Structures are given as structure tokens and as C-alpha cells.
From a paper:
The MrfB exonuclease core was purified and initial sparse matrix screens were set with the addition of MgCl2 and dTMP, which would represent the nucleotide product of the exonuclease reaction. The structure was solved by molecular replacement with the AlphaFold model for residues 33–279 as a search model. Two molecules of MrfB were present in the asymmetric unit. The dimeric status in the crystal likely arises from crystal packing as the exonuclease core eluted as a monomer on gel filtration. Density was observed for residues 34–111, 119–202 and 213–279. There was no density observed for dTMP, and only one Mg2+ (site A) was observed at the active site, coordinated by residues Asp107, Glu109 and Asp262. Furthermore, a predicted α-helix from residues 171–183 was in a random coil, which resulted in Asp172 being displaced away from the active site and unable to coordinate a Mg2+ ion in the B site. Because the mechanism for DnaQ exonucleases coordinates two metal ions, we expect that this structure represents an inactive state, and the AlphaFold model likely represents an active state. In the AlphaFold model, Phe171 is poised to base stack with the DNA, and in our structure is instead flipped into a hydrophobic pocket. Instead, we propose this conformation protects hydrophobic residues of MrfB from solvent when it is not engaged with DNA, and it becomes activated upon DNA binding.
Numbering used by the authors: 34 to 111, 119 to 202, 213 to 279
The structure:
């Protein structure tokens, strides 16, 4: 039934089965010492502390939040989301998790896996246009109770009142990507994937999205340190 499952598993992608549907889930771990551009992910802890000690009212204030509450979130689209990526920073590590829609008609499985795990009220984002949340028809209570709470932009909107992520990476964060698959190619790659279901078509897209969510961490740190200096 589900094709290329062995090939997907080598890439760290496994299926999540739900209600006669499925989605594909990838998980990568990084050490807290990992440097992504100028900053190691361990500097997040410092900026969350400084925010909690700050009397400054700001859209990016982490006052009242712990570092684990923040979901660094980025999506790819085809117009609707087909890839949900997020990173989360814990005491020993950073976890990147990606939920891939294998084709239209699997949205219940996608939302069941994503909404089970992500606090959609605490997203850190860099999205210019409002999120194109996929449409879904379900009885399930977890999903229905969230559809109208699905935000246009993250709570921590890194683009607030304000430029491409690539340009910020190079000019501000000191991040250089090797042989990146650009976001504007994801639609065409995904369109061909729907038919052929060959993992090779999306491995580059999945790496790009992974690099996206890590850069959101580096950007949040960068912007916070500028503010709290
Ligand atoms: Mg992206």
C-alpha cells in the first residue's frame, strides 16, 4: 500500500497511520552545543532568562514562557501547506520534527499528528503571507477545537512590522547553506511527488525546511540580543 517505506526509513521518515489515512514523520536531533551561524542553541536559554527579567513590552517577549514552550515553525506550500516543520529546544538537545502530507486526502492524519504535539498558540515564525492551513472534514475533537485557532502568523512573529530568510542568513546570522533546494521549487517538486511518491523528489525540500526552522532559532536569539542589549 504505502510505497518506498524502506527508502523513507533511511532518511529518518516513518508513517503515522490514522483513520485510513497517513502522514510521514521525520525527526532529527541536534546537541545544544551545535552552532547554527553566529549562535549555539544553548544561547536560547540566556535570552529567555533576560526576557523574563525585562519590563519591556514587546511582541517577541518570552516573559512567562520557558524555552520548551517555543515552537520554531516553518511550512512549505504548493495554495496550501503540505509540509509542517518545527524545532523545539530542550535541556540537552534540539528536536526537529517534520509532518509531510503524502498526498491530498491525508489531512486528518496530518492534523492528528501535528496538533497532538505542537502548541499552535506559541509559534515562532518568519512568514510573510498568512499560513495556508489545509482544509479538513473530521469529527475528531482535538482537531475541530483548533481549526479556528490556527493563526495567520506566529505569536512570536520575527517579521513584525517589517528581508528574505536567505538574505538575513547571509548578512546577519552568518549562515551559509550548501546546495540548498530553494523554497520556490517546492511546489513543482511536490506536484511531481504526489504522482511518483519517490522520496528523492523531496529530500532537498526536507533539508531546506529543516535548515529554515533552525535559522528561526538563530534569528530569535539574534533579535532578542539586539533588543535586550
Ligand atoms: Mg521555508
Amino acid at each position: 500500500d504505502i510505497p518506498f517505506l524502506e527508502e523513507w526509513e533511511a532518511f529518518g521518515m516513518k508513517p503515522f497511520i490514522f483513520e485510513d489515512e497517513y502522514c510521514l514523520i521525520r525527526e532529527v536531533e541536534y546537541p545544544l552545543s551545535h552552532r547554527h551561524g553566529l549562535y549555539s542553541f544553548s544561547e536560547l536559554e540566556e535570552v529567555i532568562t533576560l526576557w523574563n527579567q525585562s519590563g519591556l513590552s514587546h511582541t517577541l517577549s518570552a516573559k512567562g514562557y520557558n524555552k520548551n514552550n517555543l515552537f520554531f515553525f516553518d511550512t512549505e506550500t504548493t495554495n496550501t501547506i503540505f509540509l509542517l516543520g518545527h524545532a523545539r529546544v530542550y535541556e540537552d538537545r534540539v528536536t526537529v520534527k517534520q509532518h509531510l502530507l503524502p498526498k491530498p486526502g491525508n489531512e486528518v492524519a496530518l492534523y492528528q499528528s501535528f496538533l497532538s504535539e505542537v502548541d499552535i498558540t506559541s509559534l515562532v515564525t518568519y512568514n510573510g503571507k498568512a499560513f495556508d492551513w489545509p482544509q479538513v472534514k473530521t469529527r475528531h475533537t482535538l482537531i475541530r477545537d483548533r481549526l479556528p485557532k490556527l493563526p495567520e502568523f506566529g505569536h512570536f512573529d520575527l517579521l513584525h512590522g517589517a528581508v528574505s530568510l536567505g538574505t538575513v542568513e547571509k548578512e546577519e546570522l552568518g549562515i551559509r547553506r550548501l546546495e540548498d533546494t530553494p523554497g520556490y521549487l517546492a511546489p513543482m517538486l511536490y506536484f511531481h511527488f504526489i504522482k511518483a511518491q519517490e522520496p528523492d523528489l523531496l529530500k532537498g525540500v526536507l533539508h531546506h525546511n529543516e535548515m529554515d526552522v533552525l535559522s528561526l532559532i538563530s534569528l530569535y536569539i539574534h533579535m532578542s540580543k539586539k533588543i535586550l542589549s
